[PDB]
Amino acid sequence: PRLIWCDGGRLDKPGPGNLVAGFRSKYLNHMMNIWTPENIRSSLEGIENFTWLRFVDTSLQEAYRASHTDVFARAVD
């Protein structure tokens, strides 16, 4: 039906009725994420978790694009 496939049966389509799917998308993919460059820049200076990021041939933008695309789009990159 058009309820499940379009309106609010999908947990990813952020239509009205699926009021969770906007909030959950933003606060799991851009605010409370450990790969956003703001949440990397504060943890790069010693024993902490992104210590190694200075030495692998990447940058913050390399890591941030690499942690949200697919295996496909990362292969195209």
Here the tokens at position 23 are 């909030």
Binding to other proteins in span 2-21, by CB under 8 A: 2-6, 8-16, 19-21
Binding to other proteins in span 23-42, by CB under 8 A: 23-39, 41-42
- Cα–Cα distance, 34 to 27 (Å, whole number): 11
Binding to other proteins in span 39-58, by CB under 8 A: 39, 41-43, 45-47, 49, 51-58
Q: 55, exposed or middle or buried, with CB in 10 Å at 0-12, 13-18, 19+?
A: exposed
Binding site for other proteins (CB under 8 A): 1-6, 8-16, 19-39, 41-43, 45-47, 49, 51-63, 66-76
